[PDB]
């Protein structure tokens, strides 16, 4: 194994059952099966905006499993993780902490920009 969708989803839910025990609300995580649904639909909303990270998305009649390949290498599994888990905060108006929030946007800018040393146009 690489990285799965279900270890992804599980890096998500951990944390989001902190979070929910923590406000009391006491909201029960989705299952890890329901979780990588979410997971197959925030990546494929993704594809529209900002784009291809090249996740392997079920095809046709497949439904995605937990032991599926993301098709993700595993230094991505804390930038979608943290996105992931986001997304199931706001489903439940539940705040994220500043760590995760700093965390989640920190590993979002990585996954998604680069920042490029080269010689000034001057010099070139
Ligand atoms: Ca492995
Ligand atoms: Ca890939
Ligand atoms: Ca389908
Ligand atoms: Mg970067």
Same mark, same amino acid.
Do not use: C
């Given at each position: 194994?690489?990285?799965?969708?279900?270890?992804?989803?599980?890096?998500?839910?951990?944390?989001?059952?902190?979070?929910?025990?923590?406000?009391?609300?006491?909201?029960?995580?989705?299952?890890?099966?329901? $979780?990588?649904?979410? &997971?197959?639909? %925030?990546? *494929?909303?993704?594809?529209?905006? @900002?784009?291809?990270?090249?996740?392997?998305? +079920?095809?046709?009649?497949?439904?995605?499993?937990?032991?599926?390949?993301?098709?993700?290498?595993?230094?991505?599994?804390?930038?979608? $993780?943290?996105?992931? &888990?986001?997304? %199931?905060? *706001?489903?439940?108006?539940?705040? @994220?902490?500043?760590?995760?929030?700093?965390? +989640?946007?920190?590993?979002?800018?990585?996954?998604?920009?680069?920042?490029?040393?080269?010689?000034?146009?001057?010099?070139?």
């Amino acid at each position: 194994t690489v990285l799965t969708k279900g270890e992804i989803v599980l890096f998500a839910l951990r944390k989001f059952a902190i979070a929910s025990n923590a406000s009391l609300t006491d909201v029960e995580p989705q299952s890890i099966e329901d $979780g990588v649904n979410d &997971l197959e639909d %925030m990546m *494929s909303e993704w594809m529209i905006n @900002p784009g291809d990270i090249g996740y392997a998305f +079920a095809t046709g009649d497949e439904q995605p499993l937990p032991d599926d390949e993301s098709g993700l290498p595993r230094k991505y599994k804390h930038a979608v $993780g943290y996105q992931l &888990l986001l997304r %199931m905060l *706001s489903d439940y108006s539940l705040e @994220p902490t500043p760590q995760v929030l700093s965390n +989640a946007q920190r590993s979002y800018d990585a996954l998604m920009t680069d920042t490029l040393v080269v010689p000034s146009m001057r010099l070139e």
